[model samples]
Target chain A: GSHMAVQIGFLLFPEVQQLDLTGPHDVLASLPDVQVHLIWKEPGPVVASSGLVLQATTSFADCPPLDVICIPGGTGVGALMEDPQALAFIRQQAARARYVTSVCSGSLVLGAAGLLQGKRATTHWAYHELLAPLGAIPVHERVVRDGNLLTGGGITAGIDFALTLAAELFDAATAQRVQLQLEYAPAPPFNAGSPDTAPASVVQQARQRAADSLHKRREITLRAAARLAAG
Target chain B: GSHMAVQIGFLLFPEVQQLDLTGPHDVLASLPDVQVHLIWKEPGPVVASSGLVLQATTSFADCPPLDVICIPGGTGVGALMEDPQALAFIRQQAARARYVTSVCSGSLVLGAAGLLQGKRATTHWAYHELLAPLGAIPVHERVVRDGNLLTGGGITAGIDFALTLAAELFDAATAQRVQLQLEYAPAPPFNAGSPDTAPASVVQQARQRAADSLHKRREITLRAAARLAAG
Candidate 1:
């Protein structure tokens, strides 16, 4: 039986968010007869948010050209925003792929790659303002698709992003089938996911706690955006 | 300041669910301070349930004594349950660990290691009964904890399991801190996760599809448990 080869290239980094990557990969990989490749800068496993190690099936330099490219965000995104090597790779890959997508803070990397310039995107609420520093207009939506570039909100939004992507690439039926397989009809026991839905005090406490990582990420991102513009 | 060092050991297998391991690790590693280790049989990357790759921080033999051990399950559980080396490694670390945990089918591995023979544990809905064959009473709950043995239900239950474990091991305040960091509260737009909540047709269809894997796993688990019983 011939199967459709759907190449999904997942961009991994040290300290990237795990949910941002795995949540989406779970949905996409479940698609019928699809080939999803875990790609990184090198061979071996990549450490993600909180020291969770993930193995990459192929290296960035040796990956098969992908039908979709997924980028996830976390504490690492702040440093990745300033990495010219990471940014350059995104730029090159985005040029060839059918779709370029990001989750959470991953959009910052897209912005640094100049992929989000003058486009509407979303990211982790803790660092929304940083998007403007890269000439991108930030929207507080869960899943925002601007042309061929798809972006999602913080962390868990990877699920919605992947579902939306699946719906776009395949059909609603196919997307629903994948969802069924994952048992992803999520009925979370709580309702504190986004700032709009969470209690005011809880939201405030979250922002205050993450202030330092936020501040540092802003500084690094601004510097990278400046360098990219100059180049 | 005298602070306790936290060691996290994640079980990796050939086709284990990726998020089952990565999701909890995301929350754990992001702790204010902790030493997290990803342990596998050999020092290499382990492929996940969805075919994603993960790198090991240490071989199980080389891992420093752990304060906590995490086991995630998938199709790989059937094979891992039968591997003598893997079973011995789990038994050794789980013996001394302050907390022992398993997610999804990973509980079967613990059961095979003789960790669940006298405890209540849980697995994915389709395979919950298999726990009994391993000599552990199966509970159809999201997260089941007996003594130091913590087990969780189907895929993605790692989130709830970790949240509960955090609250149990540390103070509620500490668990809430980690929860706030990862935005632990979730809200799924749809409702189709378990047999209880899912439409009857959806539940029936999922069971039918998973029947083969479930049967195969039951056979493997029974054999592994018998071996442990004899030993």
Candidate 2:
């Protein structure tokens, strides 16, 4: 009696990272009887941060009630922080969603919507510090599950995030079958995925690049947090 | 004098697997001076097998010379195996490209284009048996590389395939940094990624399910292989 054709919606916006959206979509859609929707402000082509284009199947105004809601991140998330309609839609969907989720900087959008208040979460390592301002308790893990709130770390982390979510929705055996079909086993040619495992110079340069021009993002984070506090 | 900004093109066709294209794209686009293009018959929407849609930036007839060309596979690839224009396009592009690659059954497209003869390659496990007819030596690994030809196994294997290609195009350190930014560390909840590692029952069920309706795909593969043998 508790299940009604498990509907999951992933938000699409200008500059959203395509992988962040596609990774989870691939895993969850692989499950039987699961419906996945790609929503944006309108139904049309939306360019990602990397310039790849994805078509939005549904518009914000045309969406159905979602059991699970996901937000993907990119520099374009900065615009989402400023859009009232985007924030309100997230607040509305998240209010009824069985699970609220984000991959990469997308957690910042959830924080902006005031959903992360006092919730433990994670985002892209480059944007980790901004989580506190948006009201999330920062955690250093790839996938953080704080009750019904699921947060995945940077881009590729979406893969692990969806696999975990699948197991949550169905039996572990079901998710295992999906994994086998996807051949989800991975073999990275390098042991340099995390800051802890990567060379010091590589981490320093990455941090330096991110540190140089994120002032605008910081301001957006502070403003969003302030608005959430007022309400 | 030999390098001109390193252009990379991914072929997009009706039913192509989006993850197979996007995973490699996200990794390769993160590299500096690399240009990524999504190519199809026209600059319009192409619905992937998962029902997610993506836009092609260039058309096969209008694309500039590419340094790297990739084909991503799905059940839709059977159509490419039959489409002469598509096979010709792949052949023309692969002729001068520094590298020719595919993810999943995409390797079949390369083979049908007469490019995989005697070349070791791999594709989705369900379709691995079809490689020999296409003149490819099937390698049962996540990523298979033979000289300038690179093939990845199944869906998520595109992640490892792209990461490896990045290292080959650039330096290991460069690819490692890209890996870090992606947080490429994977932690699957289940240990059932490969047919070899999964339970015998799970693998049998998958192979059995695939066994039922794959006769059409096998027939298409044979037709394409026979055409190539004639040439």
Tell me, by DockQ, which candidate is best: 2
Q: What is the lDDT of candidate 1?
A: 0.76
Tens-place lDDT per residue, model 2, B176-224, is 8898887788787788989988888889888877885467789998999
Instruction: Write one digit per residue (lDDT tens) for candidate 1, span A31-144.
Output: 767777776678776776565666677777788778899888877887777777777778888998999998888988898888888998887777889889888888877777
Every candidate's DockQ is 0.31, 0.73
Candidate 2 chain B, poorest ten consecutive residues by summed lDDT: B1-10
CA RMSD for every model?
Answer: 3.3, 2.0
Candidate 2, residue A11: the lDDT equals 95
Chain A TM-score per model, please list them: 0.94, 0.96
